[PDB]
Structures are given as structure tokens and as C-alpha cells.
TrEMBL record, chain A:
Subunit structure: Homodimer or homooligomer. Interacts with CBL. Part of a complex containing CBL and activated EGFR. Interacts with ubiquitin and with mono-ubiquitinated proteins. Interacts with dynamin.
This protein's UniProt keywords: Cytoplasm, Nucleus, SH3 domain
Protein's name according to its UniProt entry: Ubiquitin-associated and SH3 domain-containing protein A
GO cellular component: cytoplasm; nucleus
Primary location recorded for the protein, binned into one broad class: cytoplasm
Any GO BP annotation: negative regulation of immune system process
Compartmental location: Cytoplasm; Nucleus
Domain of life: Eukaryota
TrEMBL record, chain B:
GO terms for biological process, alphabetical: negative regulation of immune system process
Keyword Cytoplasm applies: yes
UniProt GO cellular component terms: cytoplasm; nucleus
Signal sequence region: none
Major place of residence: cytoplasm
Keyword Nucleus: yes
Organism annotation: Mus musculus (Mouse)
Subunit description: Homodimer or homooligomer. Interacts with CBL. Part of a complex containing CBL and activated EGFR. Interacts with ubiquitin and with mono-ubiquitinated proteins. Interacts with dynamin.
Compartments (UniProt record): Cytoplasm; Nucleus
Keywords: Cytoplasm, Nucleus, SH3 domain
Taxonomic lineage: Eukaryota, Metazoa, Chordata, Craniata, Vertebrata
Name by which UniProt lists this protein: Ubiquitin-associated and SH3 domain-containing protein A
């Protein structure tokens, strides 16, 4: 059968170090350094400054570990991946990348950046306070992105004040186009997105109405990094069925800050 | 100039830390083979005498544990420091942690892991009520850990007394550190001691010429040590005294990842 696997991005640095993260890793000198190993080895090359990561943060090292471990598990599962779409958020695109690298398909498949599956604008910041990397920058930062892919919703079309109902509609519209981007291949398509997407990108396929707004927010906070939601298409009925994801869940503990001076 | 240093490092996350004492049962088939019921269980278990049953009291690194060990290894590479030797507790989680550190340092082939029962966990906290076994050097060599087959431990495995007191524990640690520090005391590099939480105190105090902490004070401090937690000592040129200093790599802080199941948590 043909399947859709919705996947949450891995741990993001600001989930661990807070909004101040960017200040914690930037020299007076203006440069980046790792004050803690969980900060990534390096940041990708970016316009409008290091200053832009603030609203579009990268994966933590743990995040990368998570994305790789899932990728590896998809390889091991024997499943066939035929396409990957990702929210323009750097945490998503990075997650897509590491999954592919462990699947050994980073060269074979090109990441399709789809703003239509971006986070609900409400939880994010306004337009004047939110910017993504350009395909060019990603290509330069070594993400094998599809330069030709025409998004169901271009980046500037995202309204920094969309309602819940507009969000779920744009998601349904985006899923629409994706499902019709060559509906033939009998493989799995990856949608690497955010917590909310596990509900807002599957319900339409399942022909279900949007959850009540309160009911929705309540469910999407419970979703962990690399959390998955799997949908399959029935041959004849053409209906979509919610099924078990092809890889196991990932459960592990935190690691709290330590200091050998804080002995006594 | 450079100085000579000792870096005590706690092992990475162990599976039973996450999945509990029942872990072995969760990843064993009705058949009797191993499988991964969650991605945090490792890809595979090493080849072991008695098959699978012995892991119960000597568990492996979780996937996360491995990530942690690797991350630190990489950081040591990046720091530019020179590592000249590694010693590890016989516990599998320790030997695994040493291995991954070396692999990221690119020295797995160049340096051989010296297994030293003298720096094993305090026996009080080890259910050698079941009887500890460990892996043998041979089994490790076969499981592809470049162990030192010639290294004569300051305390051989069977000399560990399953009822040692706190005072005996700290003394055996001091005695072991003793021999380690005299195992060619010349090279101006860093020696890794990959061991347990307790070792960050029990293996550095003697070097620092400090008396053992009060037992309660000691237990209270060692639960606060995280995976890959480090404690660094340097030797003064003249004095010959040891100084407690900042570890050559940053700390590693990250969040948990709780069990999920969508179809269910929806209703």
C-alpha cells in the first residue's frame, strides 16, 4: 500500500536552554561557541545574522541523535521511502536531513520544503519577527533540497495572524496537493513537521473534521521528539487508515547540568 | 608547558535506568531471543556466556548512553587534548563507554582499554546477591573491544568482596588509583578512568590527599552525577601534588523523551 508518515522534529536547543539560548552561545566578539555539548557543533551559514536563529532555532545534539536513531530504524524496518516533505523550519529540515542520511538516501531523494505544513502561526512569532532559510542557503548549507518544488503555499503567503480554522484548512489544502504529487508509487512519504501536524495533517486524510481547538492543543503538547503518526491508503476504498508506525517509539531520560565545583 | 592529568568519567545512560529491572524481560521473546521493543534499546547485545541471562546484573548502554559517550569523545577530539591511556571498570556499561569515547577520538586501535576491577562500583550497591560475572577479556576481545590482554589489574575480578564496607571500598579505590598513577608515570598526557558515579569522588580524593568523605555525605553527592559527568585532576610539576581543575570538555545537558503512542492517546 501507499502510506503517509507524519514525523515531529527532534529536540530543539531552545527547548533545553530557553529563549536566552542564543545569548549563551554568542561571544561578545559576536561569534558562536558551545557552552554545553548539547549545543550543535556548528550553525549553518545564514543571512540577516546569527540573529535569525532566535526565532528559527536548530536541533540540539540530542535532537540530531534522535533524528538519526529514527532514520536508522526506518532503514532496519525494510520499508521503502519514496519522498520527503518538510516544514521550512530549520529544526524540521535538519530532521529530514538526518533521517535521510541514516536511510542512505540523502543523495537519492531531495527534500521538498512545504510552508503549507509549517507550525500554526499562532504559536510562532509574526512575519516581521519570523524568517526561514532560503532554498539557496540550504543548498549551500548542504541540504539536498528540491529547487524546483512548487509549494502548495509559498513562505510569504503565511499569515502571522491565522486562526485555528485557517491553519487546519491550509494544512488540509497542503496535504491535498502532496497526496496528488504523483499519487502512484507504492512507498512511504515522510512529512517532517511539528507536533500539531500529527493531528492537522492526518485528520483530513482520514476524512475527519478538525478537533475542537482546546481538544487539539491539549493533545499536541503530549507529542515527543520524532513522535510519529502513520496513515495508509486502501486500494479500492481509496480511504485512508490510521495505523501503527513502522518504527518503535523512542524513550530516554534527561541529563541535568553538572559542575565539579558544586561539590560542596 | 603541559601537565599530567587524570579524567574520571561516569558511564553513559544504562537501559535499566530507563526501563527498570524488568528491562531484560521486555526485550526477550517467548522464544528467548533479543529484540528492540523501543528504539532506546541498543541495536544488539554482545556475545555472552549463559546467553542473555547475565545482562540482568550487568546491563548495556542505551542508545542514548551511546550518543552521550560519542558526543563526549568527539568533544575531547575537538578540545585538542592528548589522551595517552584508558582504564575502565569491568562493568559492561563502562567498557562500552570507553570504547565509544575512543572511536570518536580515533584511537580505538591505537590505545587498548585496561579493565581494572579496582575501580568497579561499590559492591554494596551491586546485586552480587545474584553474583556478578562480567564479560571476560576474551569475550570483550571477541565482541570487538580492543582490551589489553596483558594488563595486570591492581585488583582481579574474583578479589571483589560482595560485602565490602564503605571504608574498604574507598581504600581499594585508593590502592587502585595508586597503581594506575604508577603505571608509567611520565607521559605528559591525560588518562581516562571510565567508571561509576562514586568514582568521581572515590578516585580523585586520594590523589588530592583528602580523607574519604563521610559515608552519608558521599552517597548524597554521587546521586547528583549525570551520564558522562567528569572530574579532572592535574599533577603539579614540582610539588607532585594533584589539583582539582576544570574538565577539558563542557557539560552535556538535554531533556528526556517520554513514551508515546498516538492512536491510543487520541482515545
Amino acid at each position: 500500500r501507499r502510506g503517509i508518515l507524519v514525523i515531529r522534529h527532534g529536540e530543539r536547543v531552545d527547548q533545553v536552554f530557553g529563549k536566552s539560548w542564543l545569548q549563551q552561545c554568542t561571544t561578545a566578539d559576536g561569534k558562536y561557541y558551545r557552552p554545553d555539548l548539547n549545543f550543535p557543533r556548528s550553525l549553518p551559514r545564514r543571512s540577516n545574522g546569527i540573529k535569525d536563529f532566535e526565532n528559527d532555532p536548530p536541533l540540539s545534539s540530542c535532537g540530531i541523535f534522535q533524528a538519526r536513531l529514527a532514520g536508522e530504524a526506518l532503514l532496519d524496518s525494510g520499508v521503502r521511502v519514496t519522498a520527503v516533505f518538510a516544514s521550512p523550519a530549520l529544526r524540521c529540515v535538519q530532521t529530514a536531513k538526518h533521517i535521510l542520511e541514516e536511510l542512505k538516501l540523502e543523495k537519492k531523494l531531495k527534500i521538498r520544503v512545504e510552508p503549507g505544513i509549517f507550525e500554526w502561526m499562532k504559536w510562532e512569532a509574526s512575519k516581521a519577527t519570523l524568517t526561514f532559510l532560503t532554498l539557496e542557503e540550504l543548498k549551500e548549507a548542504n541540504f539536498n533540497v528540491d529547487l524546483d518544488y512548487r509549494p502548495a503555499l509559498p513562505r510569504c503567503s503565511l499569515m502571522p495572524a491565522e486562526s485555528y480554522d485557517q491553519y487546519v484548512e491550509r494544512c488540509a489544502v497542503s496535504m491535498g496537493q502532496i497526496i496528488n504529487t504523483c499519487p502512484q508509487d507504492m512507498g512511504i512519504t515522510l512529512i517532517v513537521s511539528h507536533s500539531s501536524a500529527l493531528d492537522s495533517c492526518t485528520r483530513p486524510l482520514l476524512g475527519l473534521p478538525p478537533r475542537e481547538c482546546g481538544d487539539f492543543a491539549q493533545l499536541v503538547r503530549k507529542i515527543p521528539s520524532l513522535g510519529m503518526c502513520f496513515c495508509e491508503e486502501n486500494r479500492e476504498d481509496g480511504k485512508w487508515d490510521l495505523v501503527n508506525p513502522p518504527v518503535k517509539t523512542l524513550t530516554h531520560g534527561a541529563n541535568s547540568v553538572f559542575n565539579w565545583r558544586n561539590w560542596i
